[PDB]
Amino acid sequence: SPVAGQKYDYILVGGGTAACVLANRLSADGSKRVLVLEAGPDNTSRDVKIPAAITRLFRSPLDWNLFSELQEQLAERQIYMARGRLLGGSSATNATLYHRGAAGDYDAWGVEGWSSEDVLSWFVQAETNADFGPGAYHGSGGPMRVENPRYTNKQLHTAFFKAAEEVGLTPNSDFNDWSHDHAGYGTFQVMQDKGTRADMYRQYLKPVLGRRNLQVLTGAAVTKVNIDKAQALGVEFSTDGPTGERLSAELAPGGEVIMCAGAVHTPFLLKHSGVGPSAELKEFGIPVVSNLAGVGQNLQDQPACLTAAPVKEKYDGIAISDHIYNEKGQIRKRAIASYLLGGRGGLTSTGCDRGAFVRTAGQALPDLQVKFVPGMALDPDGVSTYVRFAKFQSQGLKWPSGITMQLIACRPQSTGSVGLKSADPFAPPKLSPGYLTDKDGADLATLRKGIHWARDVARSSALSEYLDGELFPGSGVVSDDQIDEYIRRSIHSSNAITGTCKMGNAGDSSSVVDNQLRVHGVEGLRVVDASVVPKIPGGQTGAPVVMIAERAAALLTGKATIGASAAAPAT
Ligand SMILES: Cc1cc2nc3c(=O)[nH]c(=O)nc-3n(C[C@H](O)[C@H](O)[C@H](O)COP(=O)(O)OP(=O)(O)OC[C@H]3O[C@@H](n4cnc5c(N)ncnc54)[C@H](O)[C@@H]3O)c2cc1C
Ligand SMILES: CCCCCCCCCCCCCCCCCC(=O)O
Ligand SMILES: CCCCCCCCCCCCCCCCCC(=O)O
Numbered sequence: 001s002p003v004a005g006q007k008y009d010y011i012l013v014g015g016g017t018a019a020c021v022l023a024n025r026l027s028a029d030g031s032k033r034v035l036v037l038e039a040g041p042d043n044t045s046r047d048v049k050i051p052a053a054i055t056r057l058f059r060s061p062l063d064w065n066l067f068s069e070l071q072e073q074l075a076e077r078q079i080y081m082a083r084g085r086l087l088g089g090s091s092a093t094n095a096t097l098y099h100r101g102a103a104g105d106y107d108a109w110g111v112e113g114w115s116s117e118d119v120l121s122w123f124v125q126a127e128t129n130a131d132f133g134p135g136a137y138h139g140s141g142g143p144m145r146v147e148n149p150r151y152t153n154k155q156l157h158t159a160f161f162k163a164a165e166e167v168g169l170t171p172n173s174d175f176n177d178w179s180h181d182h183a184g185y186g187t188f189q190v191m192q193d194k195g196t197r198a199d200m201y202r203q204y205l206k207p208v209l210g211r212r213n214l215q216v217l218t219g220a221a222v223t224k225v226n227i228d229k230a231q232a233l234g235v236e237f238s239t240d241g242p243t244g245e246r247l248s249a250e251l252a253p254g255g256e257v258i259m260c261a262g263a264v265h266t267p268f269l270l271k272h273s274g275v276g277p278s279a280e281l282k283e284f285g286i287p288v289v290s291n292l293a294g295v296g297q298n299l300q301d302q303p304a305c306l307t308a309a310p311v312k313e314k315y316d317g318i319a320i321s322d323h324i325y326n327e328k329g330q331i332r333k334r335a336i337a338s339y340l341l342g343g344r345g346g347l348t349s350t351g352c353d354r355g356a357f358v359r360t361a362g363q364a365l366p367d368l369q370v371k372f373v374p375g376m377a378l379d380p381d382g383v384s385t386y387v388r389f390a391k392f393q394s395q396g397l398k399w400p401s402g403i404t405m406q407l408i409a410c411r412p413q414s415t416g417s418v419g420l421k422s423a424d425p426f427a428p429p430k431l432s433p434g435y436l437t438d439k440d441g442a443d444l445a446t447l448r449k450g451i452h453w454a455r456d457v458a459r460s461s462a463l464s465e466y467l468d469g470e471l472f473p474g475s476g477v478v479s480d481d482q483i484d485e486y487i488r489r490s491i492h493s494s495n496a497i498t499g500t501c502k503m504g505n506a507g508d509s510s511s512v513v514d515n516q517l518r519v520h521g522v523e524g525l526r527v528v529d530a531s532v533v534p535k536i537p538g539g540q541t542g543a544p545v546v547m548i549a550e551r552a553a554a555l556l557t558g559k560a561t562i563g564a565s566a567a568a569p570a571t
Contacts, residue, residue: 002217002239007252008035010556011235012260013222013269015040016089017542018529018549019260020200021126024143024207025553027214034213035249036205037220037237040085043201048092050339051190051197052324052347055390057093058383062086066264068431075489079433080383081301082495083264087218088201090262091542094495095350096197098146098189099539100547103178104365105411109534112505113515113563116178122551123176123543131189137177143207144546145198146189149353150344155318155466156374156403157354161185162462164356167453175357175539182538183366185356191542195343200546223425225257225273225525230289232257232524242426256524256556259501260549263530267296267418267500267512268429275519276419284423290521294512298499299416300536302369302408303435305447305487307454308377308472310402315466319401320346320375321389327398351375351386357410357538360449366538367446369410369494370454376402380472380490402471405457407450408494410538413438418500435491447491448483496541501531515562517552528552 010026012019015038027034045062047053057063064083070076084093100123103116124139130147132138161171164185172184191198208214219239226233226248234251238244251257259266270276274289276296281288311318323346324335338345351373357366379385382404392399416434421427436444451473458467469475473486501519504511512519513532519525530545537544554560 001247002215003035003247003249006033007250007255008033008234009252009255010034011249011251011255011257012036013225013235013257014038014089014259014261014265014529015087015205015216015218016084016260016262016529017091017200017545020088020091020205021546021549022258022260022528022553023214023216024204025550026556027208027211029557030211030213032213033252034215036216037222037235037249038087038216038218039221040087041218043087043092043199043206048086048088048199049197050347051096051192051195051350054093054095054350055386058082058387058390062093064264066428066431068433071433071435073436073488074491079435079491079493081264081431081433081493081497082383083262087205087216088199090495091191091199092197092201094542095352095540096190096192097350097352097540098176098191098543100176100543101537101539102182102365105535105537109503110505111503111515111534112565114503119547119551120178122547126546126550129189132174136179137174143203144191145193145203147192147194148187149190149349150192150195151320151346151349151353153318153320153374155315159463159466160354160372160457163457163460166460166462167456169356169358172357182357183359185354187354188352190350190353192348195339195348221426222261222269223272224269227273227289227522227525230522232522242424251524256526259525259527259531260529263299263497263500264418264429264431266527266529266531268420269425270295270501270519271420272425275522280419284420286423290519292512292520294502294510296418296500297415298502298510299418299432299434299497300412300499301416301433301435302410302412302494302496302536303433303443303447303491304382304406304408304494305451305490306377306380306382306404306406306472307451307458307470308402308404309458309467309470310376310400311466312468316401318466319403320349320351320373321399322401325392325399329393329395329397331393352406358453360446360453365411367409367411367442368450368453369408369539370450371406371408373404373406375404376400377404377472380486381492382406383492403463403467405454406494407447407454409443409446411536413440413442433493436488444484444487447487448480451483496536498530498533498536498541501527502534503532504534516555526552
């Protein structure tokens with residue numbers, strides 16, 4: 001009905017992080033008709049704009065509310081896996097931390113044309129940074145906004161740095177500078193513009209909505225790619241939920257469908273389109289279009305656990321929870337005034353503004369990320385405690401002052417899968433994160449050694465000054481066996497999720513897309529989102545997705561090629 005009689009050069013499945021970048025770049029010269037189909041609503045919520053309102057976005061109508069299959073290895077629990085559902089996708093609901101990982105993460109992909117030297121200029125092209133000018137590792141002029149965090153905690157932020165130094169960690173002045181080793185303690189930069197969330201709807205899509213050649217439809221749930229050698233024709237979707245008419249957006253000749261539904265929903269939709277392992281498609285009577293073993297395999301997510309400690313009575317009031325709420329759960333006037341005048345103070349924080357990367361055991365690259373939060377978790381599940389914090393408003397109760405360190409296996413060895421639990425394209429996917437399944441027990445060992453490292457930091461004189469014991473995991477949890485059980489019972493997502501449509505070299509049989517991001521076995525179909533990441537980089541995955549989308553757009557528009565290897569000579 002909104003697509004009746006129209007033909008599109010590009011159809012983007014999803015209106016999230018990658019899709020916003022692509023919609024901007026592919027509509028720029030005016031020559032191409034671009035359609036965006038997003039299942040969620042428009043990006044208008046105040047809870048998206050204010051960073052500290054991330055607490056309110058978990059388990060909300062702006063989230064997919066996805067739960068994993070029962071995980072036998074995690075005390076038989078379903079794990080919540082947050083995912084944004086609106087224009088800007090997870091960039092609209094994330095913690096805003098700006099991380100690229102290390103040069104070695106991209107070299108470890110081993111994919112032709114996607115070395116660290118190849119991807120660096122695409123990170124730089126996306127970027128405008130308030131604290132780093134143009135240089136080898138930073139750009140100025142690109143649509144993203146990055147800045148140093150605008151919340152300062154007078155006592156706890158430098159206490160964390162001093163404690164990390166007391167345990168023998170060195171400072172890292174810029175976690176995105178590839179001329180330094182990745183390990184160390186330091187500030188985490190944020191995807192914010194003077195304390196306002198700088199999501200990719202705000203930075204890339206919203207500014208170009210006036211373009212006549214760009215059509216964005218919200219409340220548009222894609223059901224499958226229409227495929228006719230298999231050739232993408234366009235995409236089926238409903239604007240009225242499960243009961244709605246199935247509409248079809250049609251490609252113009254030479255048009256492509258670009259999958260941008262993310263690492264959960266892209267492999268899910270491909271399987272619904274007949275692209276995936278033939279056994280999984282036959283199970284639900286889906287005709288096999290491209291028998292592609294890797295679709296929904298290689299799910300990589302960074303699992304997390306935490307330690308938390310209360311401050312001494314004399315330091316009551318020094319935590320970010322005290323800067324946001326008063327003793328009755330009322331949002332503090334100082335926080336509101338600082339946010340609106342100046343774009344500073346506790347509402348500019350998603351909780352962590354600094355942390356560390358750490359080698360627990362002599363690895364080539366850090367296996368552990370540490371997020372320092374100058375507030376105390378009341379649950380060993382950090383995501384649960386954020387939901388508690390949002391619900392705490394106006395309850396007439398005092399949130400106890402303290403600190404938290406979240407421990408993340410940032411380069412995990414475990415993998416999971418995404419598949420189908422039914423033939424209905426409106427049903428949730430069959431989601432298995434696979435945390436702690438790697439054969440050596442490396443991910444469990446990382447998080448166990450993480451807890452020991454967080455304990456050493458909390459015991460150090462610089463932080464010890466403020467603290468009065470330990471809440472989580474607490475006094476009862478000391479032996480390796482007690483720590484491992486705490487981790488199995490409390491492990492939660494740090495919200496990465498990559499690799500389910502993995503890019504690979506010619507000859508890599510686990511590949512779903514080639515180095516041109518083309519889906520094997522289908523013409524005119526590409527994936528441009530976190531699905532394609534071959535091996536997860538250390539740190540949060542949003543900046544890498546924008547880099548991939550920026551480079552994909554340049555390839556599609558003819559401004560760049562990927563893979564510059566000299567042809568072997570004629571003999
Ligand atoms: C809670 C949370 C915290 C995070 N913290 C950080 C962090 O601090 N820093 C950072 O860099 N990264 C962070 N990340 C990760 C980062 O946000 C993601 O890796 C990145 O945004 C993914 O981009 P994408 O384009 O692959 O997918 P998304 O941005 O998730 O976009 C996919 C889009 O597809 C839509 N969609 C799904 N199915 C359909 C359908 N059938 N039809 C139509 N549309 C559909 C979704 O609604 C969504 O809008 C976080 C993630 C979350 C969820
Ligand atoms: C508990 C989690 C934090 C909640 C934050 C909500 C703040 C509500 C107080 C009133 C906000 C007034 C300022 C309005 C700003 C709206 C967003 C923006 O335009 O940047
Ligand atoms: C915005 C302020 C919130 C204050 C909450 C109190 C402190 C709790 C810290 C929880 C520790 C782990 C952090 C969980 C982070 C959830 C979001 C994310 O995954 O980045």
